[PDB]
Write an enzyme that holds these catalytic residues in place. Sequence first.
Site, PDB file in Angstrom:
ATOM      1  N   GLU A  40     -12.718  -2.202   9.282  1.00 18.62           N
ATOM      2  CA  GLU A  40     -12.432  -3.480   9.703  1.00 18.62           C
ATOM      3  C   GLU A  40     -12.028  -3.302  11.273  1.00 18.62           C
ATOM      4  O   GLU A  40     -12.523  -4.267  12.144  1.00 18.62           O
ATOM      5  CB  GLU A  40     -11.389  -4.403   8.871  1.00 18.62           C
ATOM      6  CG  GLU A  40     -11.235  -5.717   9.919  1.00 18.62           C
ATOM      7  CD  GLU A  40     -12.466  -6.529   9.741  1.00 18.62           C
ATOM      8  OE1 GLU A  40     -13.281  -6.358   8.839  1.00 18.62           O
ATOM      9  OE2 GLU A  40     -12.272  -7.549  10.172  1.00 18.62           O
ATOM     10  N   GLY A  75      -7.878   2.594   3.910  1.00 21.24           N
ATOM     11  CA  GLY A  75      -9.076   3.049   4.693  1.00 21.24           C
ATOM     12  C   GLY A  75      -9.773   1.856   4.907  1.00 21.24           C
ATOM     13  O   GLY A  75     -10.704   1.798   6.175  1.00 21.24           O
ATOM     14  N   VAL A  76     -10.121   0.894   4.163  1.00 20.74           N
ATOM     15  CA  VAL A  76     -10.790  -0.290   4.286  1.00 20.74           C
ATOM     16  C   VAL A  76     -10.671  -1.147   5.669  1.00 20.74           C
ATOM     17  O   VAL A  76     -11.414  -1.662   6.349  1.00 20.74           O
ATOM     18  CB  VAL A  76     -11.135  -1.219   3.101  1.00 20.74           C
ATOM     19  CG1 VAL A  76     -11.794  -0.518   2.063  1.00 20.74           C
ATOM     20  CG2 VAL A  76      -9.723  -1.702   2.879  1.00 20.74           C
ATOM     21  N   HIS A 122       0.815  -1.214  -0.145  1.00 21.38           N
ATOM     22  CA  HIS A 122      -0.129   0.179   0.140  1.00 21.38           C
ATOM     23  C   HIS A 122       0.829   1.385  -0.016  1.00 21.38           C
ATOM     24  O   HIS A 122       0.725   2.102   0.715  1.00 21.38           O
ATOM     25  CB  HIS A 122      -1.060   0.136   1.083  1.00 21.38           C
ATOM     26  CG  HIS A 122      -2.247   0.866   0.618  1.00 21.38           C
ATOM     27  ND1 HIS A 122      -2.801   1.932   1.176  1.00 21.38           N
ATOM     28  CD2 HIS A 122      -3.106   0.734  -0.239  1.00 21.38           C
ATOM     29  CE1 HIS A 122      -3.791   2.410   0.756  1.00 21.38           C
ATOM     30  NE2 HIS A 122      -4.127   1.799  -0.307  1.00 21.38           N
ATOM     31  N   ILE A 128       0.620   4.206   3.406  1.00 24.84           N
ATOM     32  CA  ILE A 128      -0.703   4.844   3.664  1.00 24.84           C
ATOM     33  C   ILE A 128      -1.533   3.838   4.070  1.00 24.84           C
ATOM     34  O   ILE A 128      -1.663   2.509   3.629  1.00 24.84           O
ATOM     35  CB  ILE A 128      -1.361   5.387   2.270  1.00 24.84           C
ATOM     36  CG1 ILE A 128      -0.536   6.800   1.924  1.00 24.84           C
ATOM     37  CG2 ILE A 128      -2.910   5.481   2.752  1.00 24.84           C
ATOM     38  CD1 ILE A 128      -0.822   7.923   3.011  1.00 24.84           C
TER      39      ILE A 128
END
Lengths: 137, 139, 141, 140, 140, 140
Positions: free
Chosen positions: E62, E57-58, E48, E54
């Site tokens: 979670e 976001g997902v 990433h 970074i």
Amino acid sequence: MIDVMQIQEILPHRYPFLLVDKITELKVKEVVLGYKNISISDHVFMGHFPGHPIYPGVLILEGMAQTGGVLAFESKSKVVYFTGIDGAKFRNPVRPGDRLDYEMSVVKNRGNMWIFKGQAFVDGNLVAEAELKAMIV
Amino acid sequence: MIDVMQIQEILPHRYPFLLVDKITELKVKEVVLGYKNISISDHVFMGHFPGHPIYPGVLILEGMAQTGGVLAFESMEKSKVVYFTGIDGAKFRNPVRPGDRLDYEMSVVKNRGNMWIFKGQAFVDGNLVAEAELKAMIV
Amino acid sequence: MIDVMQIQEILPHRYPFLLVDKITELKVKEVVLGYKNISISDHVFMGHFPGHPIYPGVLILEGMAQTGGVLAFESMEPKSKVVYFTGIDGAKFRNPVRPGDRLDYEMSVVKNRGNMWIFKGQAFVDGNLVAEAELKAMIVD
Amino acid sequence: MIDVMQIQEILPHRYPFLLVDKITELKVKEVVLGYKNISISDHVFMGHFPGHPIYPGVLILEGMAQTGGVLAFESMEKSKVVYFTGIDGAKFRNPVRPGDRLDYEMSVVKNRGNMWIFKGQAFVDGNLVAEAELKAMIVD
Amino acid sequence: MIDVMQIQEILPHRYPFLLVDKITELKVKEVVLGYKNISISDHVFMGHFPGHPIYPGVLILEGMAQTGGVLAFESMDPKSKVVYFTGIDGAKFRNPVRPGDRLDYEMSVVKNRGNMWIFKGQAFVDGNLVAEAELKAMIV
Amino acid sequence: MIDVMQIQEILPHRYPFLLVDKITELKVKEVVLGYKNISISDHVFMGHFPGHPIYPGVLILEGMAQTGGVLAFESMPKSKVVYFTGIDGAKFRNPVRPGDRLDYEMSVVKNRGNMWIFKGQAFVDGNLVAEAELKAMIVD
């Protein structure tokens, strides 16, 4: 003879599929000797038998093939494709702690085609053997 | 001639932080010899220097320590723990590289109740690569 | 026929060396069909060619072998025997297998004699043969 | 006062052996403060004790060493290597656990041409967890 | 006040998909506070964004979900069931999360009806909202 | 039509966070179809349920998002970034398991200058397993 960074300058393979740690002897168009240290720090043993670490047979063949690769390459932007394996036999298990010794002799060489007799040892005990066919491109 | 299945019966350490492949010699309350095979199949080399694989010195210490753990454990006439609380005069001599067999030597210099002090050395082909004295406890 | 959790009940193999995702067909003492999904999520491609992902041929052999394992373990007259593959013959690699491919395994029994099994194995991608071999196995306690 | 990428712009260490997340303070030839976030998302805990995650002591040492590396490299004025050749009086106090911010502190006790001696300390919430004297070489 | 070993007595999640390091506060049927340490030790940064770490976001979603899992499991009087998150709504990502950040989760129950849970979730770093969402769950 | 090394020229994502293996169809400013092969070779199953491999729902959303990324990058003429700022009405229907081909479907429902709104659906053998509305923006 050839260390791993040098090998890496010849073969494109990288971790986690680089299965030769060192080449100890290399006679052009004839024979190559090299080895891989086998250790439980190796990710394969996590799943190639929880509570019973055994080095996968097919990876021994790949190690042979890679050593033969460097022999081919020394005898460098092009590729060494192994298209065949024959009479492959596995003898004894390879375990963490073993030094896995590869031996690869040229049985035939015809233009772009190479046929090797390959054997793997641990302490002078045959553990695997096969005839590998390769092509260059 | 004591292998990893059996080392893992002794130490709670597991992959990816089990740094001894085999124990070759064990004299109770005295000395232990064992080793680790060093290979590029080791994930540490991914990051302990792209294009320049070097086994991190600090891990040599940890391997020494783990070997000493086994000696400690295999010397109680079960479930305690072996806590290493100190390292002294640790010295790194030469690089350890893929292809090397990393030999540990751990000798007991002092033992008092539940305190152990070890003289430790690491070799590759008979060449000293690391040394230190290790202090350990028991629970 | 058999999903991954069930294969794991038969085979001792675990990640990262479990190379069968599903068994679709299994006729005892005869033939087994199963496959592995190939994706760049797979750690092999990290190093089996930076900027050129190619599924290692030897791993296709091992997937064939593991499929045949299941067939064998389903094919005698209990459990904890172990199935050791002692030989591979006339193995040929045809075409590269790439991320995105469904790698199809086919293993048929060519000979069975007490505890010895001999399989014709073939792997496919969209019906194209990518590899083949004769596998010898010994099943022992 | 520097971040991960800048750090990689300086040390050659990479994942999975980059043990400093951020450098918070850096006074040339003097002292360096930085830290590592400890999380069960770290591969080490898978094997440094199933059902009992403890951050290995020796990794604390390495984190100190890397932080000192940056300080060493920052006293330049490019390409040289920073070899740590000795560790002494290393002592481990309390376990370091997932969820801890592992604070590194590295002061220069001696500086002699190409040799550096550091006093190093590691903290978790202001609790000393490890300490040692680190000896470093620095060559081309 | 609950750490990783205990978290795992509750959640079935294990490395490398255990995204809560510690729960700092838990009031039954009401609210849960916990966090994850973000470090380049994390394998996700490998991919990433090489040269630009970074936190996905997902994954924040979670972690929120997992923290709510604990609250749900804790507020219940059988024992062993499963917490299935079937929906996420109005999820918004504000600011990047980077190595070195402590990623703070906050999960409040907005509705509870028999076996269905609706949570307002927010994630912070240094008190800056970085993400938010409404998460719907069901216990099985 | 778009293979995995094509994806990577376009997307900055790398293993272990590249969640698209192939793009099968791409109509500029309209629709994109692509998929991910799900296998137990995947490290997530190690921890997203020992003895019970289930592909994390949040990762389906990310796969959707990455696929939409390619569409966006393919539909305007330089280098910039595609930031997903929102997800809405996300619903998870059936579990995704090793052996499944995970099919992504991303349609543009609105497009205004720098802003994209997608309707996203994920399928396994023609069965909806997830869906959401994804909001995206394009930046330096």
